[PDB]
Every structure is written in structure tokens, then in C-alpha cells.
Design a protein around this ligand. Structure first.
Ligand SMILES: CCCCCCCCCCCCCC(=O)O
Ligand SMILES: CCCCCCCCCCCCCC(=O)O
Ligand SMILES: CCCCCCCCCCCCCC(=O)O
Ligand SMILES: CCCCCCCCCCCCCC(=O)O
Ligand SMILES: CCCCCCCCCCCCCC(=O)O
Ligand SMILES: CCCCCCCCCCCCCC(=O)O
Ligand SMILES: CCCCCCCCCCCCCC(=O)O
Ligand SMILES: CCCCCCCCCCCCCC(=O)O
Length: 582
């Protein structure tokens, strides 16, 4: 068209246009005060409305990147506040924009956002609902500049939905709080995953990302043809590269495009794309991405036919190695939506390896005729880990289960920080509840989803504070061996126990009046320390001590003289316990 702005306005809407212009500027000028952004937005919106009225109105013809960068260079305190970034304004568009992207602080040093009192929130929400959400939108945006704007805008409405609902309830806190906790963890998970996807694209490169996307896409669209899957996997990889780089506009258009393509060729991809394709521009992509699996043909032949039997496999393989392998994935993938993408990759890799050590022998056909027999132990390992661990998560609740892990992982890598062992073990226990609720069919893909961000969150810590060579061995290893490495860790025998510190086992009467969250964390922290002190303690010995303790807490936070009970009854526990544990 003649006006890009007028165009975005028209199909975006005044409401969404404004929210996004805000988020956009907030991600670039993360130091400027809110009231300052609110002025630009109006300035820009007054403009956009000018073009919608006359596509020929001065400047309406300029590209968005040009108009955007032009306004940024209007901030007078740019040089003073941002300095080095003000240098970009000297460059001409192609470079200029490239420059700003460079000087975009990923994790700026701003104060952690505190959650005010439900009542103060609801009241703020009442008197001024818009500026209430605009201010927090601005707070999140500047703190997370690489977060996909339209997705940030998606959470925004889910937040406004909870305040609308809960601030009208009699029991506000009881309503609001559990949603703000859910939303929080959800947005945090969505962020880590995106920061995790761009990490992989960088480390392992295109091939590995494509193989991943192939197995993934073909799991969702098992009816689509390998030609379509290829098409998409290719377009998809071009989108992530663009979005990762951080350009909002190019990443937005690219996703819009791929979204329309998938909607138009809908009958050629999935039957479950109905709803998503009827939604508005700003939502199509998000919808499809979160879309559900399609039922698989069931009119499906078999794999052993085209990949283990049919001679000419080496012929078709050597002709185009990766496409053949990609064909193996697409085929094995779409037949197993109950497999984690990494498990599938683990099999394609095995296959690839065999084809290489077989197509180079006298009678190949008899060399690789036992391949599938090798997929067995690779499948059962994670399968068995799921049952085993979900079976235990039932015997004991989420909390009791988290403690089993604590005792378990503390024994693996004792060297690790206690506040970290506790956090990691808590998050793990959570993955156990969020997924073991599911039936066998959806268990593995679930666990992989969560485990992937937890294991990476855990590696980033060791990144800035190494402690164990082992943890570092798996953290650096391939994303396909990243998980099986951790499960292989064995109890540390090299470890020399810690020296007793009564302070570490001295509990005053504060735990009685603490939130469940605090009682547990306090108890769990001591548990980790108990293991670090006596690492050779049986599951039995340990249970006994944990018994005389549970009761202990009771007999003292239910007695007429707390503090005395904790000092007198305490000296008895540590003394008796010290003796039991030898
Ligand atoms: C990418 C963000 C584009 C923002 C459009 C800039 C409008 C400036 C109006 C003068
Ligand atoms: C998206 C921006 C709108 C959300 C406004 C709700 C403010 C409450 C967030 C407190 C953060 C937290 O839950 O820790
Ligand atoms: C365009 C489709 C290409 C498919 C590539 C198939 C390769 C399968 C092996 C699994 C890749 C793991 C990555 C790696 O370790 O390098
Ligand atoms: C003139 C203001 C421009 C600011 C940048 C906003 C453009 C983003 C468009 C978002 C379209 C949704 C694409 C998608 O479906 O993912
Ligand atoms: C994770 C893979 C999800 C497959 C669905 C892809 C939908 C395409 C949306 C474009 C946004 C990237
Ligand atoms: C917590 C529940 C334990 C889940 C078992 C771990 C298996 C994860 C399968 C992912 C993979 O393919 O490596
Ligand atoms: C830091 C402590 C290491 C964390 C290991 C998490 C791996 C979870 C896989 C479950 C298992 O096989 O035990
Ligand atoms: C060697 C003296 C150590 C005695 C201190 C024991 C601390 C272990 C805390 C166990 C907490 C288990 C949690 C619970 O009881 O619910």
C-alpha cells in the first residue's frame, strides 16, 4: 500500500495498535519513565490516524522501520540516558535499525517487580483500569525486551480477565492469587522456552533444529505429506532465525505470512486448524502454535518395509542422506505422538549411524536388518522412568515426593548448593504432578516440555558457578544426551561429609507461624543438609529421623510454651538422631 502505518492501524485496531506501540518502545527505551512513553504512543497514534484519513499525508509513505527509528532519535535525553545508542542515529536506516538491535539490553538492571496487596491492586484496577495495565505492561516489556510483543499482549488480557473476575468476588485474594501464580509461571515458562529455542539454533545449527522441527511438525500434522512438512519446517526455521535476531517487524510479518499459508492450505495440513484460522490477525499464529494433534491415518503401512527391508535403502540414502533421514523422522514421528521429540531424534541418529556402518559392507541388507531391534532399549528407558516416578508420586504426595528427590539428587551431586538443590527438586516434583495426571499417551511429550527448561535453568546456574565436572559434562553434551546423562549420574563416593553445625539443626518457633511454602522450604533445606552431613544414611535411617522430626514440630507448635519446647525437645532430637545415624 501507500501507507504501512495506516495499514497496520486498520487491521490491528486502535486498541491493539496502542498497546503494541507501547510495548515496542518500552523494549528499546527501557530507561525512560512511563509518562514519557504514554506521550510517544499518543504522538504516534495521532499520526497513524492522520494517514488512515489520507494515505498521501506527509510521511505516511515512509516504512515502519524508518518512522520508528526517526521517533527514537527524537528522545533528547537519548545521548545522556543511553549514550552509545544515540550514536546509531548517525547511521542511515539499514544500519541504524541494525544498530538499535545491538544496543538492546537483554536483562537490564532494574528492581525486581513486587506484587502489591490484592486490595491495593483491585482498587487501582478500579479507579484507573487502563493506566493500571499499561503501567505493568510497560514494566514487563522493559524487563523482557526479547519477548514477542503480540504474545505479551496476549497475557495482558488474561491478566485483565482475572482482575475483572476476582475483584468483584467476596473472597478476592482466594480468587486472584492462584491465577496470578499460574499466569506468572506460565509467562516465565513461555519466556525460558523461547530463550532456550534461540540458544539451540545457535549452538547446534540449522540441521539439528530442522530435524527437531520435522519430528515435531509431523507429530501435529500426521496427515500432511512430507512435501508439506518440508515446506513448513523450512519456512519455520526462517521465522525462528528472524525472531531470535530480535527484529519485531520482520518476525511479525514472517509469522503472519506462515500463518496465512497454513490457513489457506489448511485441508492439506490438519483437520484441527478450524478455530485458529477463523481468529483475527494478531492471534492466528499463537493459536496454531498451541494447536492440538490431528488423528493419524491409521491406514498407515509400516516402517520396517521402506527402512529395514526394501533393498535400495542405501541407494535412496546415498542419493540424499538428510531427506531420507528426514523421511524416517516424518514417518516414525507421526506414528508416535507419545514420544518426546528428543527420543525420536535419538532413534533417527541411531538409524543414521547404522546406515553408515552398513551401506559400506559386503551384504548391507543383512547388516542393518536388526536395526529396529536396537530401538527397543532406547524407547523403554524413558518409558520406564516415567512409570517408576509417577508410581512413587502417588504413594507420596507432591511434597513427600519432592523430598524423595531431594534425598536422591543431593546424594548424586552433594557439591551443589543447598538452596539450588532445593529449588531444582521442587521444580522437578512439580513436573511430576503436572504430567503424571495425564494418561500414558501424553506423559512423555509433557515431561520433556518441562524438564527441558528446568535442566537448562539448572545448567545456566552452573554456568556462572561451576561446582561439579559431572553436571558440566551433561550440561555441555548434546540436547539429545542432555537428559539421559543426568539420569546416569551415580551417588558420589568421593564426597567427604560435612561437619555438624547445631545452628543448621536448630529450629525456633517461627516455622509454626509460617506459610506452607515456608515450613516446607525450611524443612527441606534441613533435609538436604542432613544428607550432606550423613550421606551414607539409609532410606530407612533417614525416614526414622524424619519421623521423630515431624512429630517434634507438632509437640512444640501445639504446646503451651513454644521456644522452650524447641530448645529442650530439640537437644533431644539432635542427640538421639546423632546416635541413630551413627
Ligand atoms: C516496529 C515499531 C514501528 C513503530 C512505528 C513508528 C511510528 C512513528 C510515528 C512518527
Ligand atoms: C501484563 C501486564 C499486566 C499485568 C498486571 C498485573 C500486575 C501483577 C503482577 C505481579 C507480578 C507477579 O505475579 O509476581
Ligand atoms: C531438513 C530435514 C533434515 C533432517 C536431519 C536428520 C538428522 C537426524 C539426526 C538427529 C540430529 C541431531 C543433531 C546433531 O547431533 O547434529
Ligand atoms: C505502526 C506500529 C507498528 C508496531 C509493530 C506492530 C506490528 C506487529 C504485528 C503483529 C501481527 C501478528 C502476527 C502474528 O500472527 O504473529
Ligand atoms: C513447537 C512447534 C509447533 C508447531 C506449530 C507451528 C505453528 C506455526 C506458527 C509460526 C510461529 C513460529
Ligand atoms: C518427573 C517425572 C519423571 C519423568 C521421566 C524422565 C523422562 C523424560 C523423557 C524425555 C526424554 O526423551 O529424554
Ligand atoms: C542438580 C541435580 C541433578 C538434576 C537431575 C535431573 C534429571 C531428572 C531425570 C530423572 C531421573 O532419571 O532421575
Ligand atoms: C544429625 C541431626 C539432624 C537432625 C535434624 C533433622 C532435620 C531433618 C528435617 C526433615 C524434614 C522432613 C519434612 C517433614 O517432616 O515433613
Amino acid at each position: 500500500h501507500k501507507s504501512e502505518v495506516a495499514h497496520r492501524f486498520k487491521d490491528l485496531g486502535e486498541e491493539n495498535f496502542k498497546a503494541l506501540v507501547l510495548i515496542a518502545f518500552a523494549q528499546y527505551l527501557q530507561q525512560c519513565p512511563f509518562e514519557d512513553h504514554v506521550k510517544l504512543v499518543n504522538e504516534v497514534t495521532e499520526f497513524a490516524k492522520t494517514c488512515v484519513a489520507d494515505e498521501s499525508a506527509e510521511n505516511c509513505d515512509k516504512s515502519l522501520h524508518t518512522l520508528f527509528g526517526d521517533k527514537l532519535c527524537t528522545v533528547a535525553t537519548l545521548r545522556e540516558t543511553y549514550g552509545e545508542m544515540a550514536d546509531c542515529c548517525a547511521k542511515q536506516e539499514p544500519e541504524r535499525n541494525e544498530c538499535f538491535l545491538q544496543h538492546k539490553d537483554d536483562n537490564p538492571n532494574l528492581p525486581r517487580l513486587v506484587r502489591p496487596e490484592v486490595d491495593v491492586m483491585c482498587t487501582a484496577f478500579h479507579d484507573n483500569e487502563e493506566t493500571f495495565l499499561k503501567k505493568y505492561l510497560y514494566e514487563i516489556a522493559r524487563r523482557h525486551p526479547y519477548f514477542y510483543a503480540p504474545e505479551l499482549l496476549f497475557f495482558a488480557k488474561r491478566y485483565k480477565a482475572a482482575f475483572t473476575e476476582c475483584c468483584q468476588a467476596a473472597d478476592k485474594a482466594a480468587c486472584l492469587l492462584p491465577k496470578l501464580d499460574e499466569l506468572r509461571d506460565e509467562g516465565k515458562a513461555s519466556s525460558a522456552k523461547q530463550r532456550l529455542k534461540c540458544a539451540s539454533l545457535q549452538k547446534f545449527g540449522e540441521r539439528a533444529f530442522k530435524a527437531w522441527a520435522v519430528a515435531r511438525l509431523s507429530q501435529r500434522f500426521p496427515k500432511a505429506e512430507f512435501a508439506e512438512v518440508s515446506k513448513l519446517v523450512t519456512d519455520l526455521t526462517k521465522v525462528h532465525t528472524e525472531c531470535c535476531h530480535g527484529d519485531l517487524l520482520e518476525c511479525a510479518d514472517d509469522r503472519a505470512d506462515l500463518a496465512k499459508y497454513i490457513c489457506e492450505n489448511q485441508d492439506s495440513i490438519s483437520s484441527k486448524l478450524k478455530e485458529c484460522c477463523e481468529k483475527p490477525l494478531l492471534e492466528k499464529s499463537h493459536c496454531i502454535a498451541e494447536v492440538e494433534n490431528d488423528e493419524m491415518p491409521a491406514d498407515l503401512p509400516s516402517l520396517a518395509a521402506d527402512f529395514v527391508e526394501s533393498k535400495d535403502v542405501c541407494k535412496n540414502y546415498a542419493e540424499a542422506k538428510d531427506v531420507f533421514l528426514g523421511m524416517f523422522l516424518y514417518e516414525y514421528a507421526r506414528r508416535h505422538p507419545d514420544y518426546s521429540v528428543v527420543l525420536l531424534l535419538r532413534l533417527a541418529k541411531t538409524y543414521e549411524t547404522t546406515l553408515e556402518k552398513c551401506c559400506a559392507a559386503a551384504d548391507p541388507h543383512e547388516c542393518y536388518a536388526k536395526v529396529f531391534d536396537e530401538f527397543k532399549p532406547l524407547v523403554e528407558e524413558p518409558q520406564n522412568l516415567i512409570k517408576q516416578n509417577c508410581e512413587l508420586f502417588e504413594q507420596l504426595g507432591e511434597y513427600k515426593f519432592q523430598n524423595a528427590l531431594l534425598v536422591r539428587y543431593t546424594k548424586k551431586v552433594p557439591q551443589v548448593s543447598t538452596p539450588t538443590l532445593v529449588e531444582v527438586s521442587r521444580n522437578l516434583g512439580k513436573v511430576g504432578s503436572k504430567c503424571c495426571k495425564h494418561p500414558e499417551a501424553k506423559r512423555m511429550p509433557c515431561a520433556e516440555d518441562y524438564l527441558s527448561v528446568v535442566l537448562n535453568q539448572l545448567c545456566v546456574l552452573h554456568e556462572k558457578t561451576p561446582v561439579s565436572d559431572r553436571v558440566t559434562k551433561c550440561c555441555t553434551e548434546s540436547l539429545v544426551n542432555r537428559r539421559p546423562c543426568f539420569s546416569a549420574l551415580e551417588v558420589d563416593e568421593t564426597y567427604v561429609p560435612k561437619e555438624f553445625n547445631a545452628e543448621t539443626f536448630t529450629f525456633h518457633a517461627d516455622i509454626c507461624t509460617l506459610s506452607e511454602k515456608e515450613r516446607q522450604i525450611k524443612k527441606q533445606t534441613a533435609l538436604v543438609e542432613l544428607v550432606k552431613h550423613k550421606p551414607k544414611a539409609t532410606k530407612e535411617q533417614l525416614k526414622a529421623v524424619m519421623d521423630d522430626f515431624a512429630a517434634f514440630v507438632e509437640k512444640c507448635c501445639k504446646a503451651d510454651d513454644k521456644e522452650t519446647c524447641f530448645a529442650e525437645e530439640g537437644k533431644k532430637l539432635v542427640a538421639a538422631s546423632q546416635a541413630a545415624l551413627g
